[PDB]
Design an enzyme around this catalytic site. Structure first.
Site, PDB file in Angstrom:
ATOM      1  N   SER A  67      -1.759   2.081   7.118  1.00  0.00           N
ATOM      2  CA  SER A  67      -2.315   0.769   7.451  1.00  0.00           C
ATOM      3  C   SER A  67      -1.399  -0.074   8.325  1.00  0.00           C
ATOM      4  O   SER A  67      -1.850  -1.026   8.935  1.00  0.00           O
ATOM      5  CB  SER A  67      -2.669  -0.008   6.185  1.00  0.00           C
ATOM      6  OG  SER A  67      -1.543  -0.179   5.357  1.00  0.00           O
ATOM      7  N   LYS A  78      -3.032  -8.342  -0.648  1.00  0.00           N
ATOM      8  CA  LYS A  78      -2.121  -8.565   0.467  1.00  0.00           C
ATOM      9  C   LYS A  78      -2.150 -10.011   0.938  1.00  0.00           C
ATOM     10  O   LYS A  78      -1.104 -10.663   0.997  1.00  0.00           O
ATOM     11  CB  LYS A  78      -2.464  -7.620   1.616  1.00  0.00           C
ATOM     12  CG  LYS A  78      -2.276  -6.154   1.270  1.00  0.00           C
ATOM     13  CD  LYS A  78      -2.981  -5.244   2.263  1.00  0.00           C
ATOM     14  CE  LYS A  78      -2.318  -5.290   3.627  1.00  0.00           C
ATOM     15  NZ  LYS A  78      -2.607  -4.073   4.430  1.00  0.00           N
TER      16      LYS A  78
END
Ligand code: 4KZ
Ligand code: ADP
Lengths: 537, 159
Positions: free
Chosen positions: A435, A478
């Site tokens: 990612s 996140k």
């Protein structure tokens, strides 16, 4: 006449025909309790339940969602979509209550880390429906020891702890709860999952087979709330008929909310001090961050107690008038030396660096990818205990840049004369997953072009070769980490625009989430337009 | 029962014929028991209940994957003051039909640990000249297992 008093109570309680003949044979059989007794002392634990077990003891079932909602939030915070599914399981029964309901309906099951709210809801869900909560601690049963009571083969034919839930309660329409069903092991004789089927059968939860209570007990309404943390060890023939609802975990805002009014007092009273000491809301934040590194909250309250206790000793050490206050400027004096630094953003643009966001099972973390461009042969060193997958994403970004050297004003021959080096502090924690490629894509581009990359922007996005930014996973944890770090600008793939709704409304307002699709969008966004350090060649 | 599957059902219409068209002989002579395959989206054994229901019979089920011990299908000796027989006769008990169809419930994860491998137990009833010659601990008498039309179906065919 006590041998005759057994008649008085057995004939008067209840009684359904299903449990009528179960006594008319033994109402006389046990009268030989003068000698022995193989079959006269093993029948006192027979009627003492039957003479005491409730029959038809009903209760007005709450048919008001406001009776439940207005008290569920009176006990717990957040969990909005979670509480949305909770009611979604409630009023399915009260749409066909009485008949055509107990014959077929799914079973509610709660899964989540063992720190977050898992059992208090049981007492909350039960009290909110005029029944009796009961926390059958299943942790401790992984074998065919006691899921159904023994036979009459000994004098100690105490009923099964499962059916004792029907004994402990004084009504016939209880709320029975279980704890951590995944604490079993069905790999030997007497599969401990077999009986649980009949116990939880949405068809025959009115027949409870046993070995001493030979009659399968008829229990009309038995509300169920099942708890666990892992879906795997949960028995298969049971999982397939459970409308399981997950329990997510807390955030650094609600973690301040619960302890503000629930954990702190309910530990202050029990700390002797019944209102003679108080901690400020700002101080809790430290204990929220600098010592709390748990998904649930079970770890949090223990610190506050440790404050209270060690605070209590100070009184006997030296008195103080009224209540003493504790702000964030004196906490280490109580809990000791901090154990986890915070993760605060850097603000000043830096050369060849970027703010990466990493998901972890216990929250989120703000990682800082940093790269260097030194005159070399063109090697590529990927350092920092990087996972094998991430290293693939590094070249994936690098190779994209190599085909676009003119478009971002990069060195023409940086493939050949510039030896890169990608590092990810710290060096001891295994970092894995594709990612972070969007970020790497930035710093590598910055380091070569010598234009610094502003750090007040968080970014995360998996990169493709020709340049399309792909979706990532875990946007919730996140971003929440990014805000509590103090970042107000985020970059995120267009696909993840959907899952932006799971964030709280406030944080979404705080962040100007830039939504991109190709890396060309990011490298114009992040890079300072001017060169500040000389290039390699 | 379902929608479509015009290429599915007939593969059992081409299976039941071996029993009706030849009774007494070639009706129980070690016939090839079924097996199905497909994507993990379709409800496959949903057809199962609609097989006996299709033929007016009844249906029972025991988890052969969970069949790994002797408190399961194997018997309990009559010495004890209390013990329950194997779930084979129990399955015969709950039903009132001597030929209760039984899906191979979760045998796809079949282990073969102690207390009798669930495979040896099937060998008695599956063998066309042994089913009539069962043997318990609940009893000692050769018990005639007339028929249990297993409907084998899963997505695992290795272990
Ligand atoms: B990405 O794969 O989701 C992300 C890349 C990354 C971000 C920040 C710093 C380095 C790399 N990785 C992670 O989120 C992973 C978890 C993961 C792994 C594979 C697939 C999905 C998610 N977490 C970490 O690498 C990590 C987190 N916190 C501390 C240390 N490492
Ligand atoms: N939403 C919430 N509001 C208030 N307290 C909570 C909430 N969720 C969890 N808690 C606290 O978490 C603790 C969980 O403890 P316990 O039920 O023993 O462990 P488990 O989480 O394994 O069920 C409780 O003491 C409860 O006070």
């Amino acid at each position: 006449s006590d041998l005759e008093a057994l008649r008085k109570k057995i004939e008067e309680v209840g009684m359904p025909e299903a449990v009528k003949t179960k006594a008319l044979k033994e109402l006389d059989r046990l009268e030989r309790m003068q000698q022995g007794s193989p079959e006269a002392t093993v029948a006192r634990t027979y009627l003492d339940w039957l003479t005491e077990v409730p029959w038809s003891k009903a209760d007005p079932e709450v048919l008001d969602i406001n009776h439940t909602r207005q008290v569920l939030d009176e006990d717990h915070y957040g969990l909005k979509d979670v509480k949305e599914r909770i009611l979604e399981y409630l009023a399915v029964r009260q749409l066909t209550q009485g008949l055509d309901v107990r014959n077929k309906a799914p079973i509610l099951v709660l899964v989540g880390p063992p720190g977050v709210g898992k059992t208090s809801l049981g007492r909350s869900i039960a009290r909110s429906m005029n029944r009796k909560f009961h926390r059958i601690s299943l942790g401790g049963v992984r074998d065919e020891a006691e899921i159904r009571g023994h036979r009459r083969t000994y004098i100690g034919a105490m009923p099964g702890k499962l059916i004792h839930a029907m004994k402990q309660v004084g009504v016939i329409n209880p709320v029975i709860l279980l704890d951590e069903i995944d604490k079993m092991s069905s790999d030997w004789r007497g599969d401990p999952a077999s009986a649980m089927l009949e116990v939880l059968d949405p068809e025959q939860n009115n027949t409870f087979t046993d070995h001493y209570l030979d009659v399968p007990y008829d229990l009309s309404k038995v509300f169920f709330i099942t708890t666990a943390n892992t879906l795997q060890t949960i028995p298969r023939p049971l999982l397939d008929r459970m409308e399981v609802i997950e329990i997510p975990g807390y955030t650094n805002m609600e973690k301040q909310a619960i302890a503000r009014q629930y954990l702190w007092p309910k530990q202050v009273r029990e700390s002797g001090m019944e209102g003679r000491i108080e901690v400020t809301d700002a101080a809790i934040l430290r204990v929220i961050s600098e010592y709390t590194r748990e998904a649930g909250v079970r770890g949090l309250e223990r610190e506050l107690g440790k404050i209270a206790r060690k605070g209590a000793k100070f009184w006997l050490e030296g008195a103080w008038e009224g209540l003493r206050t504790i702000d964030a400027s004196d906490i280490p004096t109580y809990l000791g030396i901090p154990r986890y630094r915070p993760d605060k953003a850097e603000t000043e643009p830096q050369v060849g660096t970027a703010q990466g966001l990493a998901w972890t099972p216990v929250g989120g973390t703000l990682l800082t990818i940093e790269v260097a461009a030194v005159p070399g042969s063109g090697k590529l060193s990927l350092t920092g205990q990087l996972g094998e997958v991430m290293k693939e994403s590094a070249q994936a970004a690098l190779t994209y840049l190599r085909a676009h050297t003119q478009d971002y004003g990069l060195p023409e021959d940086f493939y050949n004369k510039v030896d890169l080096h990608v590092h990810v502090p710290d060096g001891a924690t295994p970092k894995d997953g594709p990612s972070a490629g969007i970020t790497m894509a930035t710093a590598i581009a910055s380091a070569l072009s010598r234009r610094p990359a502003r750090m007040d922007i968080a970014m995360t996005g998996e990169v493709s070769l020709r340049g399309k930014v792909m979706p990532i996973g875990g946007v919730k944890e996140k971003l929440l980490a990014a805000h509590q770090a103090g970042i107000h600008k985020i970059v995120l793939p267009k696909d993840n625009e959907a899952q932006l709704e799971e964030l709280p409304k406030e944080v979404l307002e705080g962040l100007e989430i830039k939504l991109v699709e190709d890396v060309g969008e990011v490298l114009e966004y992040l890079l300072l337009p001017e060169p500040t350090m000389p290039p390699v060649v």
